[PDB]
């Protein structure tokens, strides 16, 4: 069951009570992923999923507390009894140990066999409802798995890792790219296995190694530069997986505070160190309700970016989109365009393919909708500035440069006539005066001995560096140049 050192922290009657359980558990050698998820799923349940308080359950109670700001009010918190949580912990533990016989598998000196890993995978896989939409909120925790039998894509891989911990396996860890999750194991942890589906269509890639996706240079596996989690990072994941969202437009104030505090907790113990996405997540949270005494969002986005550069060969994309998004919100045109340019710079070394849909859509919305709506806006301030800055126009070409370089060597075409119309319209938003102060040099002298400058890496963009910097924009020719 639960060790007595865990039990004494119960019951939790507030957010602060929960943070304590998390600090306590993070100081152990083997943080209890199962215990922690169950608490998170339990508290998310009554704060996001069923905010209506039950009236005929003598077991479940709620804790009254002083309202946050002027509005209201008494905020009620779902008190997590020990008996409730212990029963859930117990049922999960039973399920697994029941279904698998560690006798049929000899652990070779702290080494879990691959047949063992597939087995634990199946146990989870075969345990989940056939009947549900996998694309909704509040089905990430083990609370969800044990209660309703529903788990979203990434949640399955977390479930498989928590289940291995329940069996005392300690070499099976969570592998984590930016839009997919799987498992790493073996001695020194260079064995991998798919354990969940990905995307809209459920193509089960499970049982397979990951080598194929690393090889195809797809953004899903990050050229082999994905995160290999330790127990402490798996706790950070959980905290990120917290979903404060009640409605499409409404969010739970306590679930936001909880995720915020838990992220700070992690930050301080140096656990966000290697987790760019957690850093940006935390940054976004700070922008909404800054806690006094702490660093700026902008600081944090850069830590995230720093982390990506140090630990993952600057091969990640979200840390920039986090930043870009920030500026795009505070209407900082130049910093937006720069950060988007940096994003494309990272993507240029990838190939595009079917399963990279999540990121394709992001470049598409940025290129076709978010940049145009943002230029058009500034087209109206100087009419009563950035539309008069060659750095921004250069930031923009660097953007379409990275995207053209993406398309290169890729199975499916990235560009089509739909991208062209808005490239044409975005350029046109700049004065010939301005477009011309930018010089597209090839590189004068390679190496070193003892307006602004821009150099293209893609054939398309350099093939037409003349039409871009012209005075009439040849709409028709620029369009023919983006296809091949």
């Amino acid at each position: 069951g639960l060790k007595a050192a865990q039990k004494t922290l119960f019951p939790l009657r507030s957010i602060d009570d929960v943070v304590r359980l998390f600090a306590a558990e993070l100081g152990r050698e083997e943080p209890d992923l199962v215990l922690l998820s169950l608490v998170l799923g339990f508290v998310e349940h009554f704060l996001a999923v069923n905010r209506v308080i039950p009236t005929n359950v003598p077991e479940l109670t709620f804790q009254p507390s002083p309202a946050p700001d002027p509005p209201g009010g008494l905020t009620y918190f779902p008190v997590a009894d020990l008996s409730i949580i212990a029963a859930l912990y117990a049922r999960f533990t039973a399920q697994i140990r029941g279904a698998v016989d560690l006798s049929l598998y000899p652990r070779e000196g702290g080494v879990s066999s691959r047949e063992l890993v597939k087995k634990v995978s199946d146990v989870i896989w075969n345990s989940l409802s056939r009947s549900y939409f996998k694309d909704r909120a509040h089905i990430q925790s083990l609370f969800s798995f044990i209660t309703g039998t529903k788990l979203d894509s990434s949640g399955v891989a977390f479930a498989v890792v928590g289940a291995c911990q329940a069996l005392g396996l300690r070499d099976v860890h969570l592998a984590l790219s930016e839009d997919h999750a799987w498992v790493v194991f073996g001695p020194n942890g260079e064995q991998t296995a798919e354990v969940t589906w990905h995307g809209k269509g459920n193509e089960d890639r499970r049982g397979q190694t990951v080598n194929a996706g690393v090889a195809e240079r797809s953004w899903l596996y990050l050229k082999g530069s994905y995160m290999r989690c330790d127990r402490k990072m798996e706790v950070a994941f959980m905290v990120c997986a917290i979903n404060p969202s009640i409605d499409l437009h409404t969010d739970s104030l306590e679930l936001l505070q909880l995720q915020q505090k838990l992220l700070w907790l992690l930050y301080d113990l140096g656990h966000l160190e290697r987790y760019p996405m957690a850093l940006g997540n935390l940054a976004d949270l700070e922008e909404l309700e800054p806690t006094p005494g702490r660093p700026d969002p902008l600081t944090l986005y850069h830590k995230g970016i720093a982390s990506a550069k140090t630990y993952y060969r600057d091969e990640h994309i979200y840390p920039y989109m986090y930043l870009a998004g920030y500026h795009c919100r505070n209407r900082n045109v130049r910093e937006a365009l720069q950060a988007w340019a940096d994003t494309a710079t990272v993507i240029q070394d990838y190939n595009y393919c079917r399963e990279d849909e999540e990121i394709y859509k992001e470049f598409f919305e940025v290129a076709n909708d978010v940049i145009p709506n943002l230029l058009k806006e500034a087209a109206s301030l100087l009419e009563a500035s950035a539309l008069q800055d060659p750095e921004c126009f250069a930031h923009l070409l660097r953007f379409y440069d990275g995207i053209c370089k993406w398309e290169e060597g890729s199975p499916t075409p990235v560009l089509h006539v739909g991208w062209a119309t808005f490239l044409v319209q975005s350029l046109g938003r700049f004065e010939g005066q301005v477009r011309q102060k930018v010089r597209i040099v090839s590189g004068t002298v390679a190496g070193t001995a003892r307006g602004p400058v821009l150099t293209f890496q893609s054939e398309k963009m350099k093939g037409m560096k003349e039409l871009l910097v012209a005075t009439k924009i040849n709409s028709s020719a620029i369009k023919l140049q983006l296809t091949a």
């Binding site: 996405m277 957690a278 998004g325 992001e362 978010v370």
Partner: peptide, 12 residues
């Protein structure tokens, strides 16, 4: 966007 820690879509 459901992947934990993923950033908000830049659009609307």
């Amino acid at each position: 966007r459901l992947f934990p820690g993923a950033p908000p879509t830049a659009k609307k």
